[PDB]
Each structure stands twice: as structure tokens, then as C-alpha cells.
From Swiss-Prot, chain A:
Keyword Repeat in annotation: no
Species name: Mycoplasma pneumoniae (strain ATCC 29342 / M129 / Subtype 1)
PROSITE patterns: RIBOSOMAL_L14
Name of protein: Large ribosomal subunit protein uL14
NCBIfam families with a match to the protein in the record: rplN_bact
UniProt-listed Gene3D superfamilies: Ribosomal protein L14 (2.40.150.20)
From Swiss-Prot, chain D:
PANTHER family associated with the record: LARGE RIBOSOMAL SUBUNIT PROTEIN BL17M (PTHR14413:SF16), RIBOSOMAL PROTEIN L17 (PTHR14413)
Protein name: Large ribosomal subunit protein bL17
UniProt source species: Mycoplasma pneumoniae (strain ATCC 29342 / M129 / Subtype 1) (Mycoplasmoides pneumoniae)
InterPro entries in alphabetical order: Ribosomal_bL17 (IPR000456), Ribosomal_bL17_CS (IPR047859), Ribosomal_bL17_sf (IPR036373)
Organism phylogeny: Bacteria, Bacillati, Mycoplasmatota, Mycoplasmoidales, Mycoplasmoidaceae
Superkingdom assignment: Bacteria
Subunit structure: Part of the 50S ribosomal subunit. Contacts protein L32.
GN (gene name): rplQ
UniProtKB/Swiss-Prot annotation, chain E:
Region entry Disordered, spans: 1-20
UniProt cross-references to InterPro entries, sorted A to Z: Ribosomal_bL32 (IPR002677), Ribosomal_bL32_bact (IPR044957), Ribosomal_zn-bd (IPR011332)
Protein origin, superkingdom: Bacteria
Protein name: Large ribosomal subunit protein bL32
Family: Belongs to the bacterial ribosomal protein bL32 family.
GO MF annotation list: structural constituent of ribosome
Any one Gene Ontology cellular component term annotated for this protein: large ribosomal subunit
Gene name as annotated: rpmF
Pfam families with a match to the protein in the record: Ribosomal_L32p
Taxonomic source organism: Mycoplasma pneumoniae (strain ATCC 29342 / M129 / Subtype 1) (Mycoplasmoides pneumoniae)
Classification via NCBIfam families: rpmF_bact
Curated annotation (Swiss-Prot), chain F:
Stated role: One of the primary rRNA binding proteins, it binds directly near the 3'-end of the 23S rRNA, where it nucleates assembly of the 50S subunit.
Family indicated by similarity: Belongs to the universal ribosomal protein uL3 family.
Subunit and partners: Part of the 50S ribosomal subunit. Forms a cluster with proteins L14 and L19.
This protein's name: Large ribosomal subunit protein uL3
Organism: Mycoplasma pneumoniae (strain ATCC 29342 / M129 / Subtype 1)
A single cellular component GO annotation: cytosolic large ribosomal subunit
This protein's UniProt keywords: Ribonucleoprotein, Ribosomal protein, RNA-binding, rRNA-binding
Full protein segment contained here: 1 to 229 of 287
Lineage, opening ranks: Bacteria, Bacillati, Mycoplasmatota, Mycoplasmoidales, Mycoplasmoidaceae
An individual GO BP term: translation
Molecular functions (GO terms): rRNA binding; structural constituent of ribosome
Amino acid sequence: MVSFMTRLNVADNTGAKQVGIIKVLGSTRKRYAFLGDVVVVSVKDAIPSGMVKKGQVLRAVIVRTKKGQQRKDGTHLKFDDNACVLIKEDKSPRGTRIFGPVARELRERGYNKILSLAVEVV
Amino acid sequence: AATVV
Amino acid sequence: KINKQALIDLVEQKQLKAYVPEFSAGDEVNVAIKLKEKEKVRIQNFTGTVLRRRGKGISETFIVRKTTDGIPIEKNFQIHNPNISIELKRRGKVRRAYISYMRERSGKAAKIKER
Amino acid sequence: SYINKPGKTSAWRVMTVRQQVSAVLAYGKIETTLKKAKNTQKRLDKLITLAKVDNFNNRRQVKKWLLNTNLFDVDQLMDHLFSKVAPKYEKTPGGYSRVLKLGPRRGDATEMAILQLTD
Amino acid sequence: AVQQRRSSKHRRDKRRSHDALTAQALSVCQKCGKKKLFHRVCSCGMYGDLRVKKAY
Amino acid sequence: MEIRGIFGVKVGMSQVFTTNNERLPITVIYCEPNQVAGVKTEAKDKYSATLLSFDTVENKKLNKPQQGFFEKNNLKPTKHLQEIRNMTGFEMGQQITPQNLFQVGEYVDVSAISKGRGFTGAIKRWNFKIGPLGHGAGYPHRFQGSVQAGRGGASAQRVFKGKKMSGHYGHEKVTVQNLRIVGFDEANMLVLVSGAIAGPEGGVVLIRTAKKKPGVVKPIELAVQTEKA
RNA sequence: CAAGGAACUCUGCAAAUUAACCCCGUAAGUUAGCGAGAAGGGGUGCUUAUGUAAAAGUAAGCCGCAGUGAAGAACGAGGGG
RNA sequence: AGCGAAAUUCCUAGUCGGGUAAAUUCCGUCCCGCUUGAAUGGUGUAACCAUCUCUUGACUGUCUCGGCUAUAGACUCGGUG
RNA sequence: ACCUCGAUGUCGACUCAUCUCAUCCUCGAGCUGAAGCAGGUUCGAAGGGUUCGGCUGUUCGCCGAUUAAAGAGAUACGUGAGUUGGGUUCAAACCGUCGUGAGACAGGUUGGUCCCUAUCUAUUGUGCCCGUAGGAAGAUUGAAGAGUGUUGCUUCUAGUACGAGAGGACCGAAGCGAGGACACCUCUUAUGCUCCAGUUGUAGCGCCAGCUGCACCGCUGGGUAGUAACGUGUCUAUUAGAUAAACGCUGAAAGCAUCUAAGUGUGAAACUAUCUCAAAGAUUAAUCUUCCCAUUUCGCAAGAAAGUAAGAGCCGUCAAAGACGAUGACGUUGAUAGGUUACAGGUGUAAGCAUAGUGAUAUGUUGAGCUGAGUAAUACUAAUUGCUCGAGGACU
């Protein structure tokens, strides 16, 4: 689903377009990051202008997973791509605008800005 | 195999 | 002893709704879900098109797909589910009960309506 | 290992059932193994219970299994099936074929069985 | 791999101690003076009542 | 503990909704009434227990010893007999239903014989890892792994006792505890319990009071269908 | 064979795409011969009309998620010894 | 002369820079070249290599991580052995 | 230089581990250069866990990011009759050096075969026979055992105790996680070769149409039942008894003092049970219940020729089982298999016909036809009007 050494697109525009996973938080040998799982990431392909360059390491929250997950309620959410947003260290993201939908499960993790600047939450 | 050295 | 396996359907008749119409594989439908951030309930509107329809009871579930800002979104809906409103808007013609080719088609990805 | 014989596949068994049902429809008594008689019994009963409709739709659908025999070719055996086999068995629901067990064979001592019809 | 020490007659006999053939059940046909098997038909062609196979 | 037990047959599992917008998986058990056959008292057999019976069958085909025992004890001629340890407070010749042993949503545990699998491999049985598949594998590439405990008689030359090894799987009575009960049907005589239950459909199912949290309840309400035609 | 896509591992070893025909477009470098099928793309089914001997080509219409629908056809680039 | 940690280099994982999130490998320069070196040839070289090595796009059960199906064996039975 | 050359197969990696504690973490305590968080040190403790990658063949090492940590060692520096060959190292060749030469180099490079069908033992399963002073059927208890025992994050307690400001709790409670395990196919997927639909080439059923065979199940899109995880449920506790380290009261010896001599205690993932599984082959062969037996009776007086009537077995159709065997349900007083009917699911408008169209084709008849396992009814087919073993309860 989402695991080590995974390249994915960037839902917001801090300067980066393609981002690779480097490790997944939680206990040892997590090997699977779900929606809302903080992940250490690196930038691979990025536009020149912005506040980031190619080489830095940041922390990100996944907002889109192609496989999806069976929610506690019973409904299932799916995607056709993989999107992530970047944060500095706090729940507040660095991004100025978030493109595309964001999962509702993130409400259970904080990050109120993600809900606040979403085009429409699924 | 062989050649135990 | 002796049974008929209709007890599966017998313990079932306590949770069905009889207002769901018929819609097979390629129709444009809308669904609303009740979200509870607080005792104030919010009515999420979810338009889309039928992708699959399969089940043997409460397991009867369908798939709704929408597109927004170039990104497509999939969802599974249980036909028999409280706080779920199901309506039919447009009917089309498809030759497959489940359509899988839609996952890689956007742009003139539409079904001619039924005649 | 490697290239050794394909052996029994879906094709081979479907032939075996088709050819055995054709033969039993031609004559009415077949010597085979018990577990092959069990395999061909389902197709035999399905075909002979579908035979009793006497219309072109089922006449077409039955062609998927029948095949010619040493004494009659495909067409005459087809006509015979609805001429005197189908119109004879209509008041009794299914179960028209029976299997009886013989002694072990001489060569491989395998289980031999008679498959036959019953009035 | 191979055996290290020769297996005497004792080992082979204790190994074949359970290999003997068991008798197969037999029954007498009603109109056939033969000692045929159980649930089977002998060389004269009767399972009893219904006939089925040639005389020989 | 004052455990309460009852018997049934797993007939199939289906899901039913509840409040708070939660989806629950539920198994359905046909609860034929059990009939007490004996009370193992602490004074006579030195252990408290209760022996019951179920699956009544026609008396003629039933064996002679069981028929005589049931005739002398004045019980329903049944097919299965079994007892539960540490169950007291029931007289001989009594009726048992799951609607006077349990509450609406109290915790229980369920036991049944595990479904068989045939002679399985080591990796599938003890969740081992398949070895390499490329760069050369040898004639085995799916097997137990090293069973070595050492080479030489100083520490080894015997295979350790009870080491995880290939063999029979399943067909052994396993148990999963801490399951919430959801649905009672005295009109159709069925019990609907959350989670999943080991054992194939058509076997024996034993529902007992959970040894972890006896007499612990939690309210669960069946969801209602509002949108009507 | 889900998602990830070399994280495997002594190293992409093995395994996967690309194939046939037709139509577009092709570098750095060079001994000016090549490199080169470079790279990177588009069409291929059916019917009718036109078009030649047939094809090819064009247009109109039709169906299927898919049309050398099956079967046989080169993974590529950059740098070095 | 030329070339130069090169298949040559002991200290060596020499220094620095490029490449990577992170580099005893790879590329470019620096040269107390322990022992480079001129027909036992030195340097550069277009095309080619079932040659070796490094990076990379697609690519995939190599892998995170195991599962199913079909056979032919292996397993029971009959004959030989 | 003691055992091996009439061969004892040598690193590392992979899988699988097991053991010791001189503890890497979680746990308890003392001291402090312990204000509180975060520490340092020492004692007690082996139940569990103790990461993923780049470089190099590598252990080691360096580096990067995590976490509770990325422990020290051993087991022929664990394990090639379980895998690999990356190397020392076999024959080829090269660069540098030594050698006047064949050639050599702890100088380095490119290429280079890993044999073996399991006897005993040991082990995981699964059986036949026999045994427990009658047999059979069940249900039991438990002698000795096996497995499970890992923890994080956020919030309240509370910015309270502490400190001054920065900073910041012990003690408990609640909610959600990772890893491992037991299961289970309702949802999601994977598979699903006698399922469905579409589809190219080709040879046939004489041609149209419709089918059949073949081309990896011919290919493609779905998909019954079953089996599976990436899927969902739970397990990871609580407490009792005796304890280590330590902590005490009372108390003298030794009028004081002192946790000890008597006594009475507190005290941890350790220890016995509390959880799960099996178990009377536990020969020391255990307990209870129901059912069965009665034909005089002789020879070398032994209870002997009649050996159930309780039941079991032979054989048969099967799977909730399954390599074989067993186990489990049923054997004409039957629902076990097969067929038929009905129904569920899947598939998606069978074929023919009618109409529109010059033709690919389109609409109605039609949500129709089809279907291995799916659910149940139904004696139509299959399980015969069969055969064998099998009782007189030894003495006190």
C-alpha cells in the first residue's frame, strides 16, 4: 500500500513535485504507513522556485492512498494516486494551498489547517 | 566439495 | 438437527430499507451521508456513477466515483445502512455488470443515457 | 522434473466424458472405471434430462457434448436420441443411469464397472 | 545416504510384521452358484433381481 | 468462577449495523435447547461441574447404553453429551436457554474445533519465511529452516523436543475470548455474537462466560432504518 | 498474482515491457562510412463509397475496455576501463 | 616527452569536488608515482563487443510478504524391479 | 602438536534458532556532585523484544533516519547429507615488483562444475497390535507437561508537587496505535483449467447462422464454492502465594543501639498457579454411569466342544476429515453421494423472430438465456433378501 522507498506526488505546492519515503514512524518495523501516519521523506523532483530545493529531508502526512482502507464506520475510500503534504515539525503545514481531496480520518490526528484549507473533504 | 585449506 | 439456511435471511430482515430503487452498472446517482462532528448533523452530498453492484443481503454494496480538480475519488457504499440517502438521477446503458476500464479513463469518460 | 507427458487435463477429461456419453447413447452399456463412471454420470443425466424438450434450442445446446460413434455418425445418433430415448423417459424425474461394480482387472487389477441405463 | 550397519533378518521381519493381506468380504448370489464379492457382480451377470452383464 | 455455558451450531455469519455509525461482523449460532444430564458435586466427585446434552435424534437408531442411561435418568434422547466445569445451581432435568444465562451485551468466550487443513507445510503452520527465489535456490527453496542446535556431542546431536515442525494442522479445539453478544432470538431461537468464530459450519459451538471479565456488560443497540418508502 | 517498484542481492542473476507493417521526427561525436530502427510518437477491427488488378490512401458509418484483438518478431539512455 | 591512487598505490576508507537522504564502488583534478613510462611501447581515438564496471527512465513477486490453480512426480493400489 | 590425512568440507550472507548474564530496553531499590525533567553509579533480575538502508564479499567499521533498545558472548568463531558462491584457491590471462630462467608474490585484478533416492538414532505428526483378573459404550478427574507473558503515543489528574525565570512530574485513569499470535471469508482484494460474456486465426458439424477441436486455461473483462492476506475480531490482562535486591516494627544478645536470634511484616515483566492446549500406556495402567452374558458337560480335572443376544469389525456412498490409515455422518425403518425441481450468487439482453438501415449493425420479444462446488426438498440412481470377531467375570 504505502511503504519504504515509495515515490509519490505532492498535493500542495511548496516547490516539490515528487517525494520519496525514507522511513515510517511508530514502533520498530512499521513497514506500512496509513492515512495520517507521519513519514520522513526526501525530495526527488522539484520545480526551481520555492522555499525548498532538491536534497532536503522533511516530514509529511499522507492524504491519498491508492489502496485505501476500510474505515471504522464501514465505508471505504480509495484513490488512483498517492499524495502527501509537508510540515516543518508541528501539525501546521508549510503549504500555502492544498490541491485535491483529503481523507476525513485526519480529523482524528489534529492538523486542523489541513481541514481548514481543503477544497472539499470526502 | 574439496580443497579444505 | 435440521435447518434451511434461510436463518441467514431471517436474522437479516431487521435492517433493510425498502426505498432503494434499481440501478445496475452505469447510472449517474447521488448519495448523502450524515456526518457527526457534534450533535449537529451535516449532510454530505456525494454524486457519482455506478461502478459495481454485488451482494447476497446486507452485503449488497455499490461503488460511487466522482472527479474533482483532475483527481478521481472512489467510495464503497453499503446499500443497507442508516443515515444513507440513495437517489437516482440519470440512467445509462452498459454491457458489463461491473466495469473496470473506467479506472484508466478520464475525459469523454461518460455513458450515453438509456433510450 | 520436465518434458514428461501432459497427462490428464481439462481437455482430456472433457473428451472422455463427451465420448463416453456418445458411446452409451449409441449402445447403452459401457465398461470403465468407477470414478470415471461417476464423472460421466453427471453429464449423462444432464443431457438426457435436457433431451426431453424437443425443440431446436436444446437440439443446438446438446451438440456441445455429442460426437459420432462407430455404428452411427453424429446426425443419426442425434435424431435417435430424441426419436426413442428422450420420449421414453418423461414421467420419472432424473436418475436414469446406474453403475455396477465388477472384479479387479487382469492386467492392472484396476476397478472395472458397468454403466448402463434403466427402464 | 545409506545404511551404516547391516539390517539383519530381525529388522526386515519386524518391518514386514504389518504387511499381511486382509480378506475381502464375499457373498453368495441368489441364482448363481458362485462365491462372489460383496456389493459386486460375478461372471454370470446378476446383482440379484436385475441382470446386467453377458453370460460369459 | 461462576461460569455459564451453552451449546449451539454455527449456521453462518452476517453483519448487522448498530448506533454510533459502526460496522460489526457477527456470527449466527442455532441454539437448540440443552438438557442437564448431571451435576458433578464437590461432595461426591470432588469437582463442581454440570453435564448437559443436545442434538436429539430418533431413539431407534440410537445405541443401547446411551438409550438406557437416558431412560433411567428421564431425559431427552440426544446425540451429544458434554460437561462444563464450575457450573452450579441447576437441578436434574432442567431447561436451558441463552436468554437466562447472558445479558444483552455482556462479554463471553466461544470455543469450537478448528477446521481441518490436511498435512500442511512448516512455513504455513508456524508463519515462517520462504527463502530466496533467485540467484540460485537448490532443490529445496521452501522448507523448515535450520534445525541445528550444534555439531558434535558437546552441545548437540539431538533434535530439540517439540520444535516447530511440519505436521497436522487444525482439527483441534481452539478458543477466542472477549466477544460481545449482540442479538437474541427466542422467537427463532438464534444467537448473534460479534467477531468471528473458529470452526466450520455444522460443528459444535460452546459459548461460555469469559474467564477474563466475568459479568461485565456494555450496551449495544441495533441500528434502526429511518429512510422508508 | 493487490499497493510499493531494486528497498532483494556478490552485482537488475533470473523474471516483466518492445516486436509485424505503415506514417511522422532524430542528437553529442566522427576517420564523414556511420552513429540510427538513435532517442520519442501516431494508425492497424468491421461495412460502405471513392480509389487501381488487387492492395495501399481518403472519407462516412458501426461495435467492443481493449482491434498486427490469437500465435513470431529489438527494453533504452548517460559515463568509464 | 606523455600519463597518473590509473587492472600499477604499502600507508588507503590520501585530500577535495560531482553523484546519494546517507557511498572502501563510480567520474574529474591535486601527485614525497615506496614500484608509471616509451615498441616487454606511451597518449587520444569514430564504430563494435553473448567483455567488465558505475548512474538512470519504464519495468516487474528479486523483494516488503506470502497465496491460489493446473498438471507430472512425490502418496495409496496392481505388475516388474 | 594430544584426536583426525584408508579425507573431520574451511568466511560471510539467507531461513531457523537455542542457551549464559557481565543488562540494550521495559521492571524494583540504594546513594548522589538526585531543586523538577533529563541523568551518573551500584545492587536484584533472562519473560519478551532488541530496526531499516548506502559503501564494501564482508563480521567489524563509517554514515543516514527511526525507535525502548539498536546488548556482550556461546553452540566444530550455531548450522553447505537446508540454499548461494562473492574468496581465499584449483588449471586461463593481465598490471607492478622479484628472479639472467622456467616462475613466484598478505600486491591486485577479469573468468571459472557445490554429489548423495534416509537405515539407526533424535524430532514433528498419524496409525496397527497388545495391555490394565469380564466386554462394550460414554462422560470424567488430573501425575508429569507444552505455548502465550513485547509496549508506544495523546489527553485528565496539573502548568498543580518542584523551581524564580527557562523548564517541568512521580503516583493513577481514559482513548488510539506498532510487532507477534489464534482464528474467520460479512465487507476489500488475490486465486479460482467442466462458470459467464466478448474476441483473432484455423479445420470441421455440407454451406448461412449457431457450435465443436487447437493455438500458455488460445486471448481479454468479470466470477460460484473452497482456500488465502493487504481485510476484520480477539489475545499482549487482573489478582493470589512464596521470594531476590532492598524497606521495616518490636527485641535483647552486647542494659545503648540494632530489620533477626524468636516473632510479625512491605516488597518486582523472575518463581507456583490465575490464560490457552493435550493428557490415566501416569504399567504407580485412576473415578463415575449406563448397557450386555448365562445350552448338562467330558479328555493329561483343564473349567472343554457349543464363543452376545452389548458392540465392534468386513464391504459400500461420502466430507465438517483426509498422503494411506484413521476421524466423522449415513447404509432401503435412508437425505450420505448422484440426478430432478425450486432458490441464492455470477454473468449481462441466449437463439430464433419482427422492424429500421444499401452495411458494419441498432430496438422489441428480454434483466432473457446459461451455470463445478452453493441452500433445501425430493427414493428416480447408488449404498443386497450379505460375512467375521465378539458372553459364562480368576483368587481374598
